[PDB]
Ligand binder design. Structure first.
Ligand SMILES: *S(=O)(=O)c1cccc(S(=O)(=O)Nc2cc(C3=CCCC3)ccc2C(=O)NC)c1
Ligand SMILES: *S(=O)(=O)c1cccc(S(=O)(=O)Nc2cc(C3=CCCC3)ccc2C(=O)NC)c1
Ligand SMILES: [Cl-]
Lengths: 246, 236
């Protein structure tokens, strides 16, 4: 038996404008921060303990991790940030809202990019208003040209998240470390797809509740003894799960 | 040439009760958090950029670091925590206020402990109120039996802090990484003592301000080229 916990950050400041964030480093809204607090307090009430934490280089996830560590009195734990756990990169869509996206790129392309697993959105080009903000941010200075995405399908996202899982998180798990992972929807989807053997279709249909700790019981070979479970008040979990399915 | 920044955490909740905290994991008071916020604003206005951060395993220092990183938009930086940057362990005095310490231990011993570089306070014994709280905290589980103090003189604290400085932080500085250190007055004292070659008397005379970025400029031998400098408005 190993136990793994995941948490997906809540609402961001750009969610309130309905604009695509991707790699843009938007901060939690008051609501997103409350969600982090509630998840941390659920972990505390259940007495959960961790030995090492993994998050992205993006502050909505990092601040979610911080709030959780505060709530469970485990601020002293080692924390590891990696770009490989970042949100899916939304390319030229970054910063655009849905109406702007439709005007510029068409209903047809938007439908294709929405429903597809491996069709990326358009690249974020040097004239993009957020190009310098993201692609030239020094936190990616040590990425190789081939590693720095200009845009990402879900498949790209998963393909760059899973190596960090394999080479950095898995050995900690096998080292019996209790791992907490505070990241984003699409990188977490990579982890879930790998753990549970889900298809492209299922994983694209699987939305992870925000601010709800996701608990995995893994056997000796890191196979989920059961599918993901949700920690919290059973009524607020079903409500978030009905929200998410809707 | 090399630029090194230190910051001492601010007022804690046990400062408000005039209680010796030591290895007790007291949080910042609201005023102490505000101090860290102003220090961070000072760094942001100066345009300071870092590449790696070190702090202790105690939350008043960690939250000072978090506040600074938030203020300078560098929450993505790598952060390393180590017990070797902890505050002095105040053994039996942990949790006592000044009146309780006086009544229990006497003016004479209190004077000695306050004044001495190498005389530790009484050990924290198994019947001490905070014995389990600290000595059985799992964050120290990897420390050998001879590493987990029951009490520390200033000398002890500095002796256990400088190995982390020499084995981990000095390599980072020589790699060209811009280092931020968020810790505690006494553990920072060991870094300052070593950097400047201060005497026991002089380092006991040095009281580092709280919540203030302390800037060192170091030559290729990591020797300071001038006295430490402070960041912030001219008042502070
Ligand atoms: S992504 O999961 O981080 C994301 C950000 C904002 C909105 C959405 S959505 O709910 O899936 N709706 C949506 C997505 C997309 C694209 C996904 C891949 C690239 C573009 C296009 C249009 C829409 C939409 O529903 N507009 C009304 C996901
Ligand atoms: S330590 O630096 O974290 C610390 C905690 C509380 C008070 C002080 S003090 O300002 O130096 N005054 C003080 C210290 C001590 C001792 C230090 C070594 C062991 C005991 C004893 C008494 C006093 C004091 O001022 N009494 C009125 C430092
Ligand atoms: Cl951290």
């Amino acid at each position: 038996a190993y136990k793994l916990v995941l948490i997906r950050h809540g609402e961001s400041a750009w969610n309130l404008e309905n604009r695509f964030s991707g790699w843009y480093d938007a901060d939690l809204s008051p609501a997103g921060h409350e969600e982090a607090k509630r998840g941390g307090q659920a972990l505390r009430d259940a007495g959960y303990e961790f030995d090492i934490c993994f998050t992205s280089v993006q502050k909505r996830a990092i601040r979610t991790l911080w709030t959780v560590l505060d709530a469970i009195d485990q601020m002293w734990l080692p924390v590891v940030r990696t770009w490989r756990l970042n949100e899916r990169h939304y390319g030229g869509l970054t910063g655009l809202n849905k109406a702007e996206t439709a005007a510029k790129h068409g209903e047809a392309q938007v439908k294709i990019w929405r429903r597809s697993y491996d069709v990326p959105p358009p690249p974020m080009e040097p004239d993009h208003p957020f190009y310098s903000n993201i692609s030239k941010d020094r936190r990616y200075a040590d990425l190789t040209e081939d590693q720095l995405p200009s845009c990402e399908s879900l498949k790209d996202t998963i393909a760059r998240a899973l190596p960090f899982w394999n080479e950095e998180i898995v050995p900690q798990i096998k080292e019996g470390k209790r791992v907490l992972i505070a990241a984003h929807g699409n990188s977490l989807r990579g982890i879930v797809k790998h753990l549970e053997g889900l298809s492209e279709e299922a994983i694209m249909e699987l939305n992870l509740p925000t601010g709800i700790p996701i608990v995995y019981e893994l056997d000796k070979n890191l196979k989920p003894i059961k599918p993901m479970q949700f920690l919290g008040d059973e009524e607020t979990v079903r409500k978030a799960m009905e929200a998410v399915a809707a």
